[PDB]
């Protein structure tokens, strides 16, 4: 039963999202003027805080709250350790709204106890092409297309409540207050993902992992040593051999992206993402922000031939704290970010991603089965991991789609 989510304009059952065919809002139309100008009441001991994302110490404070209290695996062996530079990058894209970053502090000592972040995204989120066609066949195209235009909405990430404060109903309050701030900005939809099942996802996809340093991975117990490896003389030598990668990329004219590549990367990205039902639209400034290489944060390479960019890939780094273990502090994971291929099969392009990642010291490469990510799983030796990433809209009815129809990558 859901005391909070039942009060919210989201689909309430799996049933509701099977019956849905057109995109559009769920709630009553409202106006900025309908929305309370004052922050949601919270207890006397606490206060609403808007971190300054240009302040190293506000960034640090958020960093600490996530380092100690953010998402762990089911066995409390690992916890994400997003870096400060990653958080400045993710929290401050072009035209970000400082007010959408919502925090609760203890008034006495200014200890950060809870956080959620919103950032702008321009999202295509109209009726999927299929439902759009089924709609003509039944005479209802204008209705199916009403919301085809890309929409400036809020993307929510980094909801975190201090472990000492869990199950005190603080997360509802953070969400109501984020919602109020976003609504005051005249934005009525949001997009979010979670590893947990909430009401009600529009898409769900498994995670996949590709071992790059399997000895470390087994050592920290991220990976097992499969049963067929027993019947073998020296387990690890077989495993390392199985996962070994070339030292240098195979595509000649792969190089790191540079500022002048922005317009071309934009165009082959937009062309590719445009084929999916749900996907972001980026300006040049968003392309530079999200894809220009940044040290220990995002890593992007283009294939250029005859002075033209014809393919590119990117990945970002999130290290995970290894929670038990005396020998290892961190596990260094690369996450497949946006890419586009026009001159070579995707599997050949993403082999270079794995090669570069391995070459720079990453232990595993991770992704969700969105985009055409299923297309290279077998050949590059990715295996399905635990659990699923679920995709959600706030205040947006949307039919249930497959993850291969989603082109929004979450940080
Ligand atoms: C238009 C603008 C809209 C803007 C907002 C759009 C929506 C944004 C929504 C947020 C998108 C987040 C995207 C990400 O960042 S997903 C990552 C979420 N973060 C973590 O998992 C970090 C570790 N966990 C924690 O920090 C806490 O356990 C959290 C904060 C997750 C819950 O704190 P706590 O454990 O102390 O519980 P409570 O007593 O305060 O509250 C219990 C209520 O909270 C509902 N709950 C539990 N987990 C989640 C979850 N991941 N999303 C949404 N709701 C969740 C739960 O069903 C229950 O409601 P109800 O079942 O009683 O009805
Ligand atoms: O990349 C890593 C490093 S260890 C593990 C993990 C799980 C939960 C929280 C942090 N890290 N992990 C992982 C596993 C499954 C999904 C995701 Cl997004 C990350």
Author numbering: 11 to 421
Task: Give verbatim excerpts from the published study on this entry.
Simultaneous replacement of the R1 3-phenol-4-methoxy groups of 1 with a 2-pyridyl unit, and truncation of the R2 benzyl group to a directly linked phenyl, resulted in compound 7 and an unexpected inversion of the binding mode from that observed for 6, giving rise to binding mode T2. Compounds that adopted binding mode T2 show the R1 2-pyridyl subunit forming a hydrogen bonding interaction with the side chain of Ser330, and the thiazolidinone carbonyl group forming a hydrogen bonding interaction with the side chain of Asn376. The X-ray crystal structure also revealed the R2 substituent to be located in the hydrophobic peptide binding groove, lying in a similar plane to the aryl group in the pyrazole sulfonamide series. In binding mode T2, and in contrast to 6, the S enantiomer was bound in the active site. It is unclear why compound 7 displayed selectivity for TbNMT over hNMT. However, this observed selectivity was lost upon removal of the (R2-phenyl)-3-chloro substituent, seen with 9, although this is partly due to the overall diminished potency observed for this compound. Substitution at the ortho or meta positions of the R2 phenyl group appeared to be preferred over para substitution which may be due to a clash of this substituent with the side chain of Tyr217. Interestingly, the thiazolidinone compounds displayed two distinct binding modes with different enantiomers bound.
